[PDB]
Amino acid sequence: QMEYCRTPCTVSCNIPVVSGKECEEIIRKGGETSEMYLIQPDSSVKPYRVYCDMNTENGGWTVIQNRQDGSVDFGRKWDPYKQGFGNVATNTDGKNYCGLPGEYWLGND
Amino acid sequence: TVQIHDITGKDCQDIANKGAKQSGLYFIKPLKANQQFLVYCEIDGSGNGWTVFQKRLDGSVDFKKNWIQYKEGFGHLSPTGTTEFWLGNEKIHLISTQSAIPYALRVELEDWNGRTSTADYAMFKVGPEADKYRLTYAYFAGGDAGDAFDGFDFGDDPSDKFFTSHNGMQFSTWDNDNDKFEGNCAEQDGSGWWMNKCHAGHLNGVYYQGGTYSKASTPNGYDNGIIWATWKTRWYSMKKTTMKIIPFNRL
């Protein structure tokens, strides 16, 4: 594995058109399937990515933690928890948009 | 792979004037817009900042969409431009309609033959949602594709050329009919454009794999596909398409 970890894994995350403040706006704003989106709460904040659940209940779901295969280490110090960490989504099979989600913690701040 | 550059500006231009160089994705904030948004720039080795706002490529993204979708935008923005998309009318409007400097639309085109043709239009604007997002240019400015926005006589009718003229049309989607037709232009084609009765230009059409088709290709029998008569037959849908804009002095 140490040899495998010479060359990192690759993702092609084509940020979709429709943005917003939160995954909520984004569903109202005509975005209506579950994938990765960029969002911006306040204007003085740099935008960031996030995986919105739209199918679950009534959509508008801003996923802020996920687990499903342990694929990411969580035994982290204060700072990585403050900034967030892990994969937001992953290229679903043979498509150009990241449809499946990845294990992450969207970060504290 | 997909990344975002740290250069801001009012349009893809102000980016290139500030220091840019790479055909890619950036954040622009036009004067009157409340919160900065993401566009796919297109810089050549010249200094030209082309804010792109439409693309077709393969058929992946489907353009049969509702009012609030076209208002806000739908599709995905590759920094290699390999992805279909509509940027969203509120954005178009916000970019183009900043004063003291008019833009100019460039439609670009391509076929399943390899040939590439352009067509230009002057003093470009899209009118507020108030005005139902209205297309208003000054003049066709040349290009081997042809002025399709100045109508076209198709079959038998004499004033169908008057009925397919596009300058001065409001945007019309199935759930917001603003086209001048007894029925709904947006619905018989399953798309969203500045329809009249109906169209001579239709960049947001139903993609076709191969290009050539007919009436028997759909239950309706209409020309839902991506067409632009001044360059091609109505029964031939483009492989690729584009629509970008740029401050006029750069022309």
UniProtKB/Swiss-Prot annotation, chain A:
It is found in: Secreted. This is Fibrinogen beta chain. Cleaved by the protease thrombin to yield monomers which, together with fibrinogen alpha (FGA) and fibrinogen gamma (FGG), polymerize to form an insoluble fibrin matrix. Fibrin has a major function in hemostasis as one of the primary components of blood clots. In addition, functions during the early stages of wound repair to stabilize the lesion and guide cell migration during re-epithelialization. Was originally thought to be essential for platelet aggregation, based on in vitro studies using anticoagulated blood. Detected in blood plasma (at protein level). The lineage of its organism: Eukaryota, Metazoa, Chordata, Craniata, Vertebrata. A long coiled coil structure formed by 3 polypeptide chains connects the central nodule to the C-terminal domains (distal nodules). The long C-terminal ends of the alpha chains fold back, contributing a fourth strand to the coiled coil structure. Disulfide bonds join C13-C98, C23-C52. It is linked to Congenital afibrinogenemia: Rare autosomal recessive disorder is characterized by bleeding that varies from mild to severe and by complete absence or extremely low levels of plasma and platelet fibrinogen. Dysfibrinogenemia, congenital: A disorder characterized by qualitative abnormalities (dysfibrinogenemia) of the circulating fibrinogen. Affected individuals are frequently asymptomatic, but some patients have bleeding diathesis, thromboembolic complications, or both. In some cases, dysfibrinogenemia is associated with low circulating fibrinogen levels (hypodysfibrinogenemia). Heterohexamer; disulfide linked. Contains 2 sets of 3 non-identical chains (alpha, beta and gamma). The 2 heterotrimers are in head to head conformation with the N-termini in a small central domain. Conversion of fibrinogen to fibrin is triggered by thrombin, which cleaves fibrinopeptides A and B from alpha and beta chains, and thus exposes the N-terminal polymerization sites responsible for the formation of the soft clot. The soft clot is converted into the hard clot by factor XIIIA which catalyzes the epsilon-(gamma-glutamyl)lysine cross-linking between gamma chains (stronger) and between alpha chains (weaker) of different monomers.
Curated annotation (Swiss-Prot), chain B:
Ca(2+) binds at D177, D179, F181, G183. The gamma-chain carries the main binding site for the platelet receptor. The gene is FGG. It comes from Homo sapiens. Its main location: secreted. Changing G168D: In Hillsborough; prolonged thrombin clotting time. This is Fibrinogen gamma chain. Keywords: Blood coagulation, Calcium, Coiled coil, Disease variant, Disulfide bond, Glycoprotein, Hemostasis, Isopeptide bond, Metal-binding, Phosphoprotein, Secreted, Signal, Sulfation. The chain holds residues 168 to 418 of 453 of the full protein. Together with fibrinogen alpha (FGA) and fibrinogen beta (FGB), polymerizes to form an insoluble fibrin matrix. Has a major function in hemostasis as one of the primary components of blood clots. In addition, functions during the early stages of wound repair to stabilize the lesion and guide cell migration during re-epithelialization. Was originally thought to be essential for platelet aggregation, based on in vitro studies using anticoagulated blood. However, subsequent studies have shown that it is not absolutely required for thrombus formation in vivo. It is found in: Secreted. Residues 233-251 are annotated as: Gamma-chain polymerization, binding amino end of another fibrin alpha chain. Detected in blood plasma (at protein level). One of its GO terms (cellular component) is platelet alpha granule lumen. Conversion of fibrinogen to fibrin is triggered by thrombin, which cleaves fibrinopeptides A and B from alpha and beta chains, and thus exposes the N-terminal polymerization sites responsible for the formation of the soft clot. The soft clot is converted into the hard clot by factor XIIIA which catalyzes the epsilon-(gamma-glutamyl)lysine cross-linking between gamma chains (stronger) and between alpha chains (weaker) of different monomers. Sulfation of C-terminal tyrosines increases affinity for thrombin. It is linked to Congenital afibrinogenemia: Rare autosomal recessive disorder is characterized by bleeding that varies from mild to severe and by complete absence or extremely low levels of plasma and platelet fibrinogen. Dysfibrinogenemia, congenital: A disorder characterized by qualitative abnormalities (dysfibrinogenemia) of the circulating fibrinogen. Affected individuals are frequently asymptomatic, but some patients have bleeding diathesis, thromboembolic complications, or both. In some cases, dysfibrinogenemia is associated with low circulating fibrinogen levels (hypodysfibrinogenemia). Heterohexamer; disulfide linked. Contains 2 sets of 3 non-identical chains (alpha, beta and gamma). The 2 heterotrimers are in head to head conformation with the N-termini in a small central domain. Residues 3-249 form the Fibrinogen C-terminal domain.
